[PDB]
Design a protein around this ligand. Sequence first.
Ligand SMILES: Nc1ncnc2c1ncn2[C@@H]1O[C@H](COP(=O)(O)OP(=O)(O)O)[C@@H](O)[C@H]1O
Ligand code: BEF
Ligand SMILES: [Mg+2]
Length: 253
Amino acid sequence: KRLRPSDKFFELLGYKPHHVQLAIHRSTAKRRVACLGRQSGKSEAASVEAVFELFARPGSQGWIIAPTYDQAEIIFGRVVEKVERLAEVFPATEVQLQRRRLRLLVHHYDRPVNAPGAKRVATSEFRGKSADRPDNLRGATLDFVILDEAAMIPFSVWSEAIEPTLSVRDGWALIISTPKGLNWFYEFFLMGWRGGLKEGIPNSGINQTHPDFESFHAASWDVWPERREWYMERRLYIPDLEFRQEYGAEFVS
Ligand SMILES: Nc1ncnc2c1ncn2[C@@H]1O[C@H](COP(=O)(O)OP(=O)(O)O)[C@@H](O)[C@H]1O
Ligand code: BEF
Ligand SMILES: [Mg+2]
């Protein structure tokens, strides 16, 4: 089996996923590739996936990798907030923060941590990592990785550093980004794209797929149709190709 977050888990986080987020979260594919527009909730979904593992699979170890250390810092902070809030309603957990290392542990016990005879059962681990510091990415064995703004991460970093961390455990990867042309993120996206011909996806509908891959595509106004006009105003003062790529989530060049 492959464990995925329940409606109840989302509620306990005060998290109401959009339909696209819902689709990403329920997928059991070992390689999930999500091509989404700016401000659609990519980083949010990433943080939620990390929290689920820490609490729902005691002992799990994984990373979110972002392109730059500053982004990794930010998203590490966002995961910390969610973990600390959820630890409130889980008496049998104890959180250990190592902020200067962008490292976080969640210790699981066999009973409320406050109670007599509490046995530590498992320790979950999460870290924020950055593609601009590839020396930090070696030596690890992990259950999951999440690549945030993956299309800005060099392919070599995925192939040489990140993917090998998943081998022993047959761990999963979530690869999420606003697109940046026809680079490796585009190639990986196509491997999981079964949605047929779609505007903004070159050669969609005639692409070959792999069973371990599942792909998701939505422009910022498709994930968040409520505020379609807010996104569309940017159309009038942002160049066409840039608007189409950054909010449309189109693969351009
Ligand atoms: N399902 C959601 N419900 C409410 N707010 C959301 C949801 N998803 C994302 N957000 C909020 O929208 C903003 C952008 O999300 P974020 O993940 O940071 O953007 P991006 O997709 O560009 O990474 C944030 O303030 C975030 O809290
Ligand atoms: F502002 Be989002 F992370 F693209
Ligand atoms: Mg983001």
